């Protein structure tokens, strides 16, 4: 019985209670999603004897498991064909890794766990560091990282995140921890094709890894998505403070949970709290396009909604910036100031991004700024499901099947709630867990049935 | 500011075409766009002179004069962008589809749905990259639940019945119905003959479409000539004669 609250004068379980008169209690509890199933399959199918209603008397100081194996059973079951025999043990069990699975990243994102690059030299201790161009004044990128498959130089060559606009605001997010050796080795052995079990010894960062294979699959993976799952809160909640400093937009994440909890980080991930803060950033982005809209100059008295500000971005941002497109790549360092109408827009702005002296750094500015814009139509796309769904879970839901690519969830809570995850929007191409041996075979195992093959095939990697 | 001056140092603009273009724009977005069938007619002249030279600067101050010729947006600077894209069809590079794409959907009209998706059509030509991408963008893009009927049943016609699949799950999720029956038929001509794709898309077309027996005969005929002699199709024409 996993009780709210006691009887009070108006005869509701408590939540300050009431005017405690008298000495009884009646008080409603709800222990688990199949609390009321095993009862019902004695009265039922077997018809046999109560037993929630055949009630002495009440003691302080499962069944969701039997249907989670039931219903995993009972379907396809299809597998990730490189972890049902490395769960079966049936196959060299040093084959579920990355060496053992063909399709490792030809060159991946190792951006995050490395801020400089003599850093990552050292970190590269048993490979031929192949950076390709010799300016150290030059060379801190998030550097893209090929390890071959002679045939073991760490290909290094630098990488220009490019630009968002004229603000240093958004000065995209580096990591700032530099994770052990074995600790990016367990990064990458975790974003390329495989299963990874890190041994975390105590003070190590085992969250610290999992934050940095948050930030590398957000990297190397923009679409697919990424099931953070945990023995208890603790995970989710430190991970999450972790992760607010890195390169994510809460339009990409989201959380489950087992019912009541109460928020253990800075920021909100929850369902009503996050359909509120991004119904904020939609007016957000509603005034921001409309600002433009202003700074483009047209008539209008009245203001439009996301379907309209998305398509009236393809229609008068698009075509302004096609006609910028048609006289730049056509284009000198005036017209890279000049031909762009932007000047009304970042005229609410740093001064201008155009800087007049270097085609190319004017040129970087001027699209960097188009594509600021293209992003504020592109979170009103994002803000079309928060204009589309009715309710505040379900906005949570739609917002977290479409969009949010990080959802954080519990060990039972999921194994209780993954017939709906797995209905609306269930996306395992990507696992990220933590608390390892906190959790059992069975807690391991039930999160293995979260949804159905694919053409004969699971949706793992 | 008489459109008569200026449609006269247009054509009489000589030399280089450039200057000729570039003043005409400026003048021309200057003052009002009533001399919008000079400008026409001028575009279509100019190509006429010109359209043996080098694609870049020509074709380049046309399409500014285009857009130029757009005050705001208009019925006929997206017909000039049409221009452009069927005179550039005959491409040989594709930027060519995505910058005339740009500027006639630079509005929201029935204009130039037909000419990106028989362009999306003429993409799936050997690269099916931009036809089932274009699909998929084009099934979450701007609404008409026609436009993802016209999607499953263009991926119909090329060899992804995936992207068949993909644009009639869009549809049934939200003639069209009887496309999806169409496209279903046609993934179902007798090639993948295990006996499984044609069977489950008549359980699927005879599923969101209704047909008082006919089609389920059909499948009948076709699921007992392609059953079994076991329990299998004893069962399989048992249940047949009861439904």
């Given at each position: 019985?996993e009780?709210?609250?006691?009887?009070?004068?108006?005869?509701?379980?408590?939540?300050?209670?009431?005017?405690?008169?008298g000495?009884?209690?009646?008080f409603?509890?709800?222990?688990?999603?199949?609390?009321?199933?095993?009862?019902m399959?004695?009265?039922?199918?077997?018809?046999?004897?109560?037993?929630?209603?055949?009630?002495?008397?009440?003691?302080?100081?499962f069944?969701?498991?039997?249907?989670?194996?039931?219903?995993?059973?009972?379907?396809?079951?299809?597998?990730?064909?490189?972890?049902?025999?490395?769960?079966?043990?049936?196959?060299?069990?040093?084959?579920?890794?990355?060496?053992?699975?063909?399709?490792?990243?030809?060159?991946?994102?190792?951006?995050?766990?490395?801020?400089?690059?003599?850093?990552?030299?050292?970190?590269?201790?048993?490979?031929?560091?192949?950076?390709?161009?010799?300016?150290?004044?030059?060379?801190?990128?998030?550097?893209?990282?090929?390890?071959?498959?002679?045939?073991?130089?760490?290909?290094?060559?630098?990488?220009?995140?490019?630009?968002?606009?004229?603000?240093?605001?958004?000065?995209?997010?580096?990591?700032?921890?530099?994770?052990?050796?074995?600790?990016?080795?367990?990064?990458?052995?975790?974003?390329?094709?495989?299963?990874?079990?890190?041994?975390?010894?105590?003070?190590?960062?085992?969250?610290?890894?999992?934050?940095?294979?948050?930030?590398?699959?957000?990297?190397?993976?923009?679409?697919?998505?990424?099931?953070?799952?945990?023995?208890?809160?603790?995970?989710?909640?430190?991970?999450?403070?972790?992760?607010?400093?890195?390169?994510?937009?809460?339009?990409?994440?989201?959380?489950?949970?087992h019912?009541?909890?109460?928020?253990?980080?800075?920021?909100?991930f929850?369902?009503?709290?996050?359909?509120?803060?991004?119904?904020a950033?939609?007016?957000?982005?509603?005034?921001?396009v409309?600002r433009?809209?202003?700074?483009?100059?047209?008539?209008?008295?009245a203001?439009?909604?996301?379907?309209?500000a998305?398509?009236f971005?393809?229609?008068?941002?698009?075509?302004?910036?096609?006609?910028?497109?048609?006289?730049?790549?056509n284009?000198?360092?005036?017209?890279?100031?000049?031909?762009?109408?932007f000047?009304?827009?970042?005229?609410?702005?740093?001064?201008?991004?155009?800087?007049?002296?270097?085609?190319?750094?004017?040129?970087?500015?001027?699209?960097?700024?188009?594509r600021?814009?293209?992003?504020?139509?592109?979170?009103?796309?994002?803000?079309?499901?928060?204009?589309?769904?009715?309710?505040?879970?379900?906005?949570?839901?739609?917002?977290?099947?479409?969009?949010?690519?990080?959802?954080?969830m519990?060990?039972?809570?999921?194994?209780?709630?993954?017939?709906?995850?797995?209905?609306?929007?269930?996306?395992?191409?990507?696992?990220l867990?933590?608390?390892?041996?906190?959790?059992?075979?069975?807690?391991?195992?039930?999160?293995?049935?979260?949804?159905?093959?694919?053409?004969?095939?699971?949706?793992?990697? | 500011?008489?459109?008569?001056?200026?449609?006269?140092?247009?054509?009489?603009k000589?030399?280089?075409?450039?200057?000729?273009?570039?003043?005409?724009?400026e003048?021309?977005?200057?003052?009002?766009?009533?001399?919008?069938?000079?400008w026409?007619?001028?575009?279509?002249?100019?190509?006429?002179?010109?359209?043996?030279?080098?694609?870049?600067?020509?074709?380049?101050e046309?399409?500014?004069?285009?857009?130029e010729?757009?005050?705001?947006?208009?019925?006929?600077?997206?017909?000039?962008?049409?221009?452009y894209?069927?005179?550039?069809?005959?491409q040989?590079?594709?930027?060519?589809?995505?910058?005339?794409?740009?500027?006639?959907?630079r509005?929201?009209?029935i204009?130039?749905?037909?000419?990106?998706?028989?362009?999306?059509?003429?993409?799936?030509?050997?690269?099916?990259?931009?036809?089932?991408?274009?699909?998929?963008?084009?099934?979450?893009?701007?609404?008409?639940p026609?436009?993802?009927?016209?999607?499953?049943?263009?991926?119909?016609?090329?060899?992804?019945l995936?992207?068949?699949?993909?644009?009639?799950?869009?549809?049934?999720?939200?003639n069209?119905?009887?496309?999806?029956?169409?496209?279903?038929?046609?993934?179902?001509?007798?090639?993948?003959?295990?006996?499984?794709?044609?069977?489950?898309?008549?359980?699927?077309?005879?599923?969101?479409?209704?047909?008082?027996?006919?089609?389920?005969?059909?499948?009948?005929?076709?699921?007992?000539i392609?059953?079994?002699?076991?329990?299998?199709?004893?069962?399989?024409?048992?249940?047949?004669?009861?439904?």
């Amino acid at each position: 019985c996993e009780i709210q609250g006691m009887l009070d004068d108006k005869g509701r379980v408590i939540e300050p209670r009431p005017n405690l008169r008298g000495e009884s209690r009646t008080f409603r509890v709800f222990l688990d999603p199949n609390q009321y199933q095993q009862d019902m399959t004695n009265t039922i199918q077997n018809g046999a004897e109560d037993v929630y209603e055949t009630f002495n008397i009440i003691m302080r100081r499962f069944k969701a498991v039997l249907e989670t194996i039931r219903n995993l059973m009972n379907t396809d079951c299809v597998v990730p064909d490189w972890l049902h025999d490395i769960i079966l043990g049936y196959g060299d069990p040093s084959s579920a890794h990355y060496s053992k699975m063909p399709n490792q990243i030809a060159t991946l994102d190792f951006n995050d766990t490395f801020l400089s690059i003599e850093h990552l030299k050292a970190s590269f201790p048993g490979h031929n560091v192949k950076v390709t161009v010799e300016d150290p004044a030059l060379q801190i990128p998030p550097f893209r990282i090929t390890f071959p498959v002679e045939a073991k130089t760490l290909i290094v060559e630098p990488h220009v995140i490019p630009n968002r606009g004229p603000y240093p605001y958004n000065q995209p997010k580096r990591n700032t921890i530099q994770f052990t050796h074995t600790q990016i080795e367990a990064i990458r052995a975790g974003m390329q094709p495989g299963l990874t079990m890190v041994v975390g010894p105590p003070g190590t960062g085992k969250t610290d890894v999992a934050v940095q294979i948050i930030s590398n699959i957000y990297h190397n993976f923009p679409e697919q998505r990424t099931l953070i799952v945990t023995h208890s809160n603790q995970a989710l909640n430190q991970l999450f403070e972790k992760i607010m400093a890195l390169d994510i937009d809460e339009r990409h994440l989201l959380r489950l949970g087992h019912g009541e909890e109460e928020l253990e980080t800075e920021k909100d991930f929850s369902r009503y709290g996050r359909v509120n803060y991004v119904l904020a950033r939609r007016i957000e982005l509603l005034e921001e396009v409309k600002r433009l809209q202003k700074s483009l100059g047209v008539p209008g008295d009245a203001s439009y909604t996301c379907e309209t500000a998305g398509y009236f971005f393809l229609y008068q941002v698009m075509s302004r910036w096609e006609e910028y497109i048609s006289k730049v790549k056509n284009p000198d360092v005036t017209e890279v100031s000049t031909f762009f109408p932007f000047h009304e827009y970042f005229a609410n702005a740093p001064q201008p991004i155009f800087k007049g002296r270097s085609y190319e750094e004017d040129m970087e500015i001027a699209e960097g700024c188009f594509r600021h814009i293209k992003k504020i139509f592109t979170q009103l796309e994002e803000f079309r499901a928060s204009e589309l769904l009715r309710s505040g879970l379900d906005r949570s839901k739609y917002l977290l099947v479409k969009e949010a690519k990080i959802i954080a969830m519990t060990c039972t809570h999921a194994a209780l709630k993954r017939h709906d995850l797995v209905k609306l929007g269930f996306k395992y191409d990507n696992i990220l867990m933590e608390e390892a041996a906190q959790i059992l075979e069975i807690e391991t195992f039930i999160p293995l049935l979260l949804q159905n093959p694919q053409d004969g095939f699971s949706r793992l990697k | 500011f008489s459109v008569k001056c200026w449609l006269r140092y247009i054509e009489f603009k000589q030399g280089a075409p450039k200057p000729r273009l570039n003043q005409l724009y400026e003048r021309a977005l200057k003052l009002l766009p009533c001399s919008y069938k000079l400008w026409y007619r001028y575009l279509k002249a100019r190509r006429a002179q010109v359209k043996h030279r080098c694609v870049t600067d020509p074709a380049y101050e046309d399409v500014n004069n285009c857009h130029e010729r757009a005050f705001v947006f208009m019925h006929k600077m997206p017909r000039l962008w049409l221009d452009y894209c069927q005179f550039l069809m005959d491409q040989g590079r594709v930027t060519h589809t995505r910058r005339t794409f740009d500027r006639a959907l630079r509005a929201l009209p029935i204009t130039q749905h037909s000419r990106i998706w028989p362009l999306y059509l003429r993409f799936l030509r050997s690269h099916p990259l931009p036809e089932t991408a274009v699909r998929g963008y084009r099934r979450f893009l701007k609404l008409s639940p026609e436009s993802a009927e016209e999607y499953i049943e263009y991926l119909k016609s090329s060899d992804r019945l995936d992207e068949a699949a993909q644009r009639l799950a869009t549809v049934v999720n939200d003639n069209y119905q009887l496309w999806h029956e169409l496209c279903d038929l046609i993934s179902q001509n007798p090639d993948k003959v295990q006996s499984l794709n044609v069977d489950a898309i008549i359980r699927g077309g005879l599923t969101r479409f209704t047909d008082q027996l006919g089609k389920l005969w059909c499948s009948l005929a076709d699921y007992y000539i392609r059953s079994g002699h076991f329990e299998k199709a004893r069962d399989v024409y048992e249940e047949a004669i009861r439904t």
